[PDB]
């Protein structure tokens with residue numbers, strides 16, 4: 001399915017520290033973030049998405065249209081400008097963030113009841129799994 005709509009509660013988070021370190025997020029901020037429980041809210045309407053990842057201190061929001069490049073400034077993360085592009089590869093939602101870091105982006109799959117998110121930077125992959133609330 002290409003559906004991603006819903007409220008998604010994190011069940012597992014693998015190598016979040018390694019991925020934050022690959023982005024050069026400062027150590028002190030990584031220590032605050034690393035085991036915060038995350039909720040991911042996705043609103044999807046045709047090509048248009050609004051994605052909100054929320055925690056206690058610390059949010060990450062992005063809105064985009066599938067197939068339309070957009071500038072992203074990761075102000076609450078590593079504070080870089082990337083040219084982002086989200087597309088479908090079959091039923092996989094794929095984002096490439098072109099910029100300083102190589103292999104930077106994310107992918108979302110659904111399998112069973114569950115949303116699988118892989119965040120990449122350099123040689124690091126962070127694997128998260130969410131259940132729909």
Ligand SMILES: *C/C=C(C)/C=C/C=C(C)/C=C/C1=C(C)CCCC1(C)C
Pocket residue numbers: 020033034036038040051053054055058059060077106108117
């Ligand atoms: C499709 C879903 C995506 C791309 C969600 C990405 C979520 C993040 C990059 C969240 C990052 C966060 C940190 C690096 C610090 C802790 C706060 C978070 C969880 C919002």
